[PDB]
């Protein structure tokens, strides 16, 4: 058990993996070609989608979720009436707190401004 | 205050895992958060890679996926999830030819040694990383010389008696004319040993919801015995059932410093000899150890509660930071005091000094006698292990044992102290 | 601190619990008052006897004075002495002065949960069942968790009282705070709503 | 509200500008033209707290 | 950097590194600059001095 | 489009979301009360859309 040379410090054997795992080598590779994909998927708003699910996969029931939802919601703008009416709102300010309360990251309410835009009047024009 | 200016460039017992420890799971769908695996000559262990900021509800530290656990049921008919015994195996003749109640470590160590033989299972990689029959600090792989300086009579038969059941079912089912396939798996007596032993000291029961199904699982999660226990967790294990992954939670509203060590209570509440008997160790801030006292002389517990900021019911006893300012002298270990001691109450009735000093005296009176009814004294045996340098762990253990039920004497005895003096104010 | 010094305060208060223990206050205040001819200041633990002095006898009026006294001289009161106190509100049933205390206990940062337990069941004790609801309810909204004997003797009482409306929301609490109502919890209910007339 | 209910839409614009408990007039009229083949349609609340019976006005 | 009275050696080094101005070198760490190919702990310290001096 | 997504003419935006926009012009001050936002709605300021 406890094993210790001359110094008197300790020596312990060091625990590694001695046989050899085939899915070691083939899933450590990272696609590099993925930048417009995930730009075009936070744009668009896909991230809070897998917020979403996040949340229900740790839910009970759904229908309970989304009655929590609107009531922490209301709850919100209740308190802060002039903050939850433009950029911001009130369930997507709930979405992104409860994914922050797991312990990750995300924007407040998921909000993103257009870094881009020319002047106050030009409005991004949608190609349909 | 530039960073070039800036110049940044202990704990060395500890040391990083291994990368591949985390790798082999992390393609598994398992996901560590904030955390990171240290091992030493104490063995591995979970310790935080950055300041944890509280959040309203718990954050999520691990999650580990169903299918890398081996679970079993405590309750006849004995169903493995992640199924991994065919049909028909001899195996299962052996898992079900055991005591449905007292052979739970049993059915799990056929579990562990099916699963290393498996090649496709994941067991048969992460078993790498368990420690071997030397380094795991059970009790039941311990021999006399250990269970001699253990000095515990009733804790020693017990192990005796594990070791007796244990080496008995071995020659049962592993005789001359078991096939093959079950023989490879044990193919000496010690190797059972050492299975039933990490059976033992890595089992986590648990009620989870499997699909449509709830039931109790004697359960073997990866990654997560590697948490270390404590009576006063950080963080706590939590099943999820929609994907079935087991959830390892940080306690919510709790921050967690870096490097801090994340823990759970593997037992709720429990004494040093039953987690000995269990897990081979023990902690000398157990709040439910006892002590064998005569009844005649008792105090106000009430009073004692109080000089040490002590609160709640016995059911809920704790203590409190705030409120005591530093108090370095309190701890867990006094609180099992506050049961363990005889005492007196009524409605509001105060205590008289005097006849507690007259009683605190005659109660540490009695409180030398223990100290001097073991030979060593608890620095004696903590200055042998500094000395020691060639032992089995399991011979550490024991002497911490003895070592944490002595000062658990020597504590209550500066805790009566104190206690004594603090009662005129 | 002499070592004389704590043996006076021992000698002291070695007679003074003497008194507490005979439900005499007017005699405890002499043994503060000579203690404080004595020169040592006047401690937390002091007051204790002679709150409990009060307490025994059922001088809330007593008691209150003791309180403010020992809030008078600048030192935090003993949790026993505060447990004390609501006690014995419970007792008479005055329910505005067993919240009061609550509140400086939480001001004082103490376990308020503990002394709430106390001060619903001697208003149950009391027949008080009425201001006990308010007591119960209030503490039940705050989030604290009520033991597995007061939810059961508090909504029984209630039942008992054909008091449906506040079991009914006593048992929507205890499940809120994670405990589920059995049959027996259920029998209560059906205790009075088997005599609305509505089956 | 979003259809003919007045009494909610009258103030559902000013809810949503600055930022029910009553049965909807569909329903109302429901009644009245039962009411006018000499059949009562009532509609009650029997409380789940003290049991009391209330009528709600349609 | 160019008007820090550089080593050859060092100038070269920052450069291939894409560090050319002084603001520049002043948010890298000495880490960041061991890490450089031709880099020696040695130089670091050497480099500092020349900004003490500025 | 995204799978989530659908595209609305401003024609039609305006008309569902007449009170949204009536609270966003008040709430920012650019209009200061229903009367001016509403006309101001009518007189298409860019600011609206
Ligand atoms: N709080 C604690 N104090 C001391 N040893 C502990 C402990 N929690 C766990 N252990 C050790 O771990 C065993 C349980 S399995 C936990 C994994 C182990 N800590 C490891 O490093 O691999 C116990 O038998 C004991 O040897």
């Given at each position: 058990?406890?094993?210790?040379?001359?110094?008197?410090?300790?020596?312990?054997?060091?625990?590694?993996?001695?046989?050899?795992?085939?899915?070691?080598?083939?899933?450590?590779?990272?696609?590099?070609?993925?930048?417009?994909?995930?730009?075009?998927?936070?744009?668009?708003?896909?991230?809070?989608?897998?917020?979403?699910?996040?949340?229900?996969?740790?839910?009970?029931?759904?229908?309970?979720?989304?009655?929590?939802?609107?009531?922490?919601?209301?709850?919100?703008?209740?308190?802060?009436?002039?903050?939850?009416?433009?950029?911001?709102?009130?369930?997507?300010?709930?979405?992104?707190?409860?994914?922050?309360?797991?312990?990750?990251?995300?924007?407040?309410?998921?909000?993103?401004?257009?870094?881009?835009?020319?002047?106050?009047?030009?409005?991004?024009?949608?190609?349909? | 205050?530039?960073?070039?200016?800036?110049?940044?460039?202990?704990?060395?017992?500890?040391?990083?895992?291994?990368?591949?420890?985390?790798?082999?799971?992390?393609?598994?769908?398992?996901?560590?958060?904030?955390?990171?695996?240290?091992?030493?000559?104490?063995?591995?262990?979970?310790?935080?890679?950055?300041?944890?900021?509280?959040?309203?509800?718990?954050?999520?530290?691990?999650?580990?996926?169903?299918?890398?656990?081996?679970?079993?049921?405590?309750?006849?008919?004995?169903?493995?999830?992640?199924?991994?015994?065919?049909?028909?195996?001899?195996?299962?003749?052996?898992?079900?030819?055991?005591?449905?109640?007292?052979?739970?470590?049993?059915?799990?160590?056929?579990?562990?040694?099916?699963?290393?033989?498996?090649?496709?299972?994941?067991?048969?990689?992460?078993?790498?990383?368990?420690?071997?029959?030397?380094?795991?600090?059970?009790?039941?792989?311990?021999?006399?010389?250990?269970?001699?300086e253990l000095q515990d009579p009733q804790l020693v038969?017990?192990?005796?008696?594990?070791?007796?059941?244990?080496?008995?079912?071995?020659?049962?089912?592993?005789?001359?004319?078991?096939?093959?396939?079950?023989?490879?798996?044990?193919?000496?007596?010690?190797?059972?040993?050492?299975?039933?032993?990490?059976?033992?000291?890595?089992?986590?029961?648990?009620?989870?919801?499997?699909?449509?199904?709830?039931?109790?699982?004697?359960?073997?999660?990866?990654?997560?015995?590697?948490?270390?226990?404590?009576?006063?967790?950080?963080?706590?294990?939590?099943?999820?059932?929609?994907?079935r992954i087991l959830e390892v939670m940080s306690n919510?509203?709790?921050?967690?410093?870096?490097?801090?060590?994340?823990?759970?209570?593997?037992?709720?509440?429990?004494?040093?000899?039953?987690?000995?008997?269990?897990?081979?160790?023990?902690?000398?801030?157990?709040?439910?150890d006892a002590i064998p006292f005569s009844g005649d002389?008792?105090?106000?517990?009430?009073?004692?509660?109080?000089?040490?900021?002590?609160?709640?019911?016995?059911?809920?006893?704790?203590?409190?930071?705030?409120?005591?300012?530093?108090?370095?002298?309190?701890?867990?270990?006094?609180?099992?005091?506050?049961?363990?001691?005889?005492?007196?109450?009524?409605?509001?009735?105060?205590?008289?000094?005097?006849?507690?000093?007259?009683?605190?005296?005659?109660?540490?009176?009695?409180?030398?006698?223990?100290?001097?009814?073991?030979?060593?004294?608890?620095?004696?045996?903590?200055?042998?292990?500094?000395?020691?340098?060639?032992?089995?762990?399991?011979?550490?253990?024991?002497?911490?044992?003895?070592?944490?039920?002595?000062?658990?004497?020597?504590?209550?005895?500066?805790?009566?102290?104190?206690?004594?003096?603090?009662?005129?104010? | 601190?002499?070592?004389?010094?704590?043996?006076?305060?021992?000698?002291?208060?070695?007679?003074?619990?003497?008194?507490?223990?005979?439900?005499?206050?007017?005699?405890?205040?002499?043994?503060?008052?000579?203690?404080?001819?004595?020169?040592?200041?006047?401690?937390?633990?002091?007051?204790?006897?002679?709150?409990?002095?009060?307490?025994?006898?059922?001088?809330?009026?007593?008691?209150?004075?003791?309180?403010?006294?020992?809030?008078?001289?600048?030192?935090?009161?003993?949790?026993?002495?505060?447990?004390?106190?609501?006690?014995?509100?419970?007792?008479?049933?005055?329910?505005?002065?067993?919240?009061?205390?609550?509140?400086?206990?939480?001001?004082?940062?103490?376990?308020?949960?503990?002394?709430?337990?106390?001060?619903?069941?001697?208003?149950?004790?009391?027949?008080?069942?009425?201001?006990?609801?308010?007591?119960?309810?209030?503490?039940?909204?705050?989030?604290?968790?009520?033991?597995?004997?007061?939810?059961?003797?508090?909504?029984?009482?209630?039942?008992?009282?054909?008091?449906?409306?506040?079991?009914?929301?006593?048992?929507?609490?205890?499940?809120?705070?994670?405990?589920?109502?059995?049959?027996?919890?259920?029998?209560?209910?059906?205790?009075?709503?088997?005599?609305?007339?509505?089956? | 509200?979003?259809?003919?209910?007045?009494?909610?839409?009258?103030?559902?614009?000013?809810?949503?500008?600055?930022?029910?408990?009553?049965?909807?007039?569909?329903?109302?009229?429901?009644?009245?033209?039962?009411?006018?083949?000499?059949?009562?349609?009532?509609?009650?609340?029997?409380?789940?707290?003290?049991?009391?019976?209330?009528?709600?006005?349609? | 950097?160019?008007?820090?009275?550089?080593?050859?050696?060092?100038?070269?080094?920052?450069?291939?590194?894409?560090?050319?101005?002084?603001?520049?070198?002043?948010?890298?760490?000495?880490?960041?600059?061991?890490?450089?190919?031709?880099?020696?702990?040695?130089?670091?310290?050497?480099?500092?001095?020349?900004?003490?001096?500025? | 489009?995204?799978?989530?997504?659908?595209?609305?003419?401003?024609?039609?935006?305006?008309?569902?979301?007449?009170?949204?926009?009536?609270?966003?012009?008040?709430?920012?001050?650019?209009?200061?009360?229903?009367?001016?936002?509403?006309?101001?709605?009518?007189?298409?300021?860019?600011?609206?859309?």
């Amino acid at each position: 058990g406890i094993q210790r040379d001359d110094n008197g410090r300790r020596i312990w054997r060091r625990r590694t993996l001695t046989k050899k795992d085939d899915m070691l080598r083939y899933k450590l590779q990272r696609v590099p070609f993925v930048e417009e994909q995930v730009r075009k998927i936070k744009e668009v708003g896909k991230v809070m989608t897998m917020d979403i699910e996040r949340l229900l996969l740790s839910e009970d029931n759904r229908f309970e979720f989304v009655n929590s939802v609107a009531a922490e919601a209301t709850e919100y703008v209740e308190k802060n009436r002039d903050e939850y009416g433009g950029t911001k709102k009130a369930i997507f300010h709930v979405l992104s707190n409860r994914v922050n309360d797991l312990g990750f990251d995300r924007p407040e309410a998921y909000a993103e401004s257009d870094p881009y835009k020319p002047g106050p009047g030009y409005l991004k024009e949608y190609y349909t | 205050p530039f960073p070039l200016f800036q110049s940044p460039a202990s704990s060395s017992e500890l040391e990083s895992a291994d990368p591949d420890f985390y790798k082999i799971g992390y393609v598994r769908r398992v996901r560590a958060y904030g955390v990171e695996f240290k091992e030493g000559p104490d063995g591995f262990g979970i310790y935080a890679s950055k300041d944890i900021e509280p959040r309203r509800r718990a954050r999520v530290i691990m999650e580990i996926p169903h299918e890398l656990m081996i679970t079993i049921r405590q309750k006849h008919p004995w169903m493995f999830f992640p199924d991994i015994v065919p049909i028909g195996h001899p195996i299962f003749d052996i898992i079900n030819s055991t005591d449905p109640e007292r052979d739970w470590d049993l059915r799990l160590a056929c579990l562990l040694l099916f699963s290393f033989d498996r090649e496709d299972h994941f067991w048969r990689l992460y078993g790498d990383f368990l420690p071997a029959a030397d380094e795991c600090s059970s009790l039941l792989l311990a021999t006399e010389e250990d269970l001699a300086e253990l000095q515990d009579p009733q804790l020693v038969s017990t192990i005796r008696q594990q070791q007796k059941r244990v080496l008995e079912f071995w020659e049962k089912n592993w005789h001359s004319g078991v096939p093959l396939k079950i023989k490879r798996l044990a193919e000496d007596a010690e190797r059972f040993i050492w299975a039933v032993s990490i059976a033992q000291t890595r089992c986590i029961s648990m009620k989870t919801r499997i699909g449509a199904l709830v039931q109790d699982l004697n359960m073997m999660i990866p990654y997560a015995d590697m948490l270390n226990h404590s009576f006063e967790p950080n963080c706590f294990l939590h099943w999820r059932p929609k994907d079935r992954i087991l959830e390892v939670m940080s306690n919510a509203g709790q921050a967690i410093k870096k490097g801090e060590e994340m823990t759970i209570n593997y037992m709720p509440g429990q004494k040093n000899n039953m987690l000995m008997e269990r897990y081979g160790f023990s902690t000398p801030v157990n709040p439910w150890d006892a002590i064998p006292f005569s009844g005649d002389s008792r105090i106000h517990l009430n009073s004692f509660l109080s000089v040490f900021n002590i609160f709640g019911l016995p059911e809920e006893y704790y203590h409190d930071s705030e409120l005591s300012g530093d108090d370095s002298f309190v701890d867990g270990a006094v609180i099992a005091a506050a049961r363990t001691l005889p005492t007196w109450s009524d409605i509001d009735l105060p205590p008289i000094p005097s006849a507690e000093r007259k009683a605190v005296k005659e109660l540490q009176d009695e409180c030398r006698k223990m100290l001097a009814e073991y030979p060593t004294t608890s620095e004696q045996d903590q200055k042998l292990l500094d000395s020691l340098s060639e032992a089995r762990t399991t011979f550490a253990t024991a002497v911490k044992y003895r070592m944490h039920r002595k000062m658990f004497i020597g504590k209550i005895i500066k805790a009566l102290d104190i206690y004594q003096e603090r009662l005129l104010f | 601190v002499s070592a004389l010094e704590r043996s006076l305060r021992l000698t002291f208060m070695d007679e003074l619990m003497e008194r507490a223990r005979n439900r005499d206050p007017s005699g405890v205040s002499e043994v503060i008052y000579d203690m404080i001819a004595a020169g040592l200041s006047p401690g937390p633990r002091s007051f204790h006897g002679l709150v409990v002095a009060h307490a025994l006898n059922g001088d809330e009026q007593g008691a209150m004075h003791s309180l403010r006294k020992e809030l008078g001289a600048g030192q935090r009161p003993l949790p026993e002495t505060m447990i004390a106190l609501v006690r014995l509100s419970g007792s008479k049933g005055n329910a505005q002065r067993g919240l009061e205390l609550l509140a400086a206990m939480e001001k004082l940062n103490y376990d308020i949960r503990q002394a709430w337990l106390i001060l619903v069941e001697e208003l149950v004790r009391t027949n008080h069942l009425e201001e006990a609801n308010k007591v119960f309810l209030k503490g039940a909204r705050g989030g604290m968790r009520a033991t597995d004997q007061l939810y059961d003797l508090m909504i029984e009482e209630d039942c008992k009282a054909g008091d449906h409306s506040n079991a009914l929301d006593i048992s929507y609490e205890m499940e809120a705070a994670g405990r589920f109502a059995t049959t027996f919890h259920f029998n209560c209910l059906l205790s009075v709503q088997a005599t609305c007339g509505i089956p | 509200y979003k259809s003919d209910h007045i009494r909610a839409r009258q103030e559902v614009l000013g809810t949503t500008i600055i930022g029910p408990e009553d049965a909807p007039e569909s329903f109302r009229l429901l009644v009245r033209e039962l009411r006018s083949l000499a059949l009562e349609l009532n509609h009650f609340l029997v409380s789940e707290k003290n049991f009391q019976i209330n009528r709600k006005e349609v | 950097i160019d008007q820090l009275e550089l080593p050859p050696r060092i100038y070269n080094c920052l450069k291939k590194s894409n560090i050319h101005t002084l603001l520049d070198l002043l948010n890298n760490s000495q880490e960041d600059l061991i890490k450089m190919e031709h880099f020696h702990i040695e130089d670091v310290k050497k480099l500092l001095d020349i900004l003490e001096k500025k | 489009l995204s799978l989530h997504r659908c595209g609305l003419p401003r024609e039609i935006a305006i008309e569902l979301f007449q009170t949204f926009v009536i609270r966003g012009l008040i709430r920012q001050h650019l209009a200061s009360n229903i009367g001016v936002a509403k006309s101001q709605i009518r007189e298409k300021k860019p600011i609206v859309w």
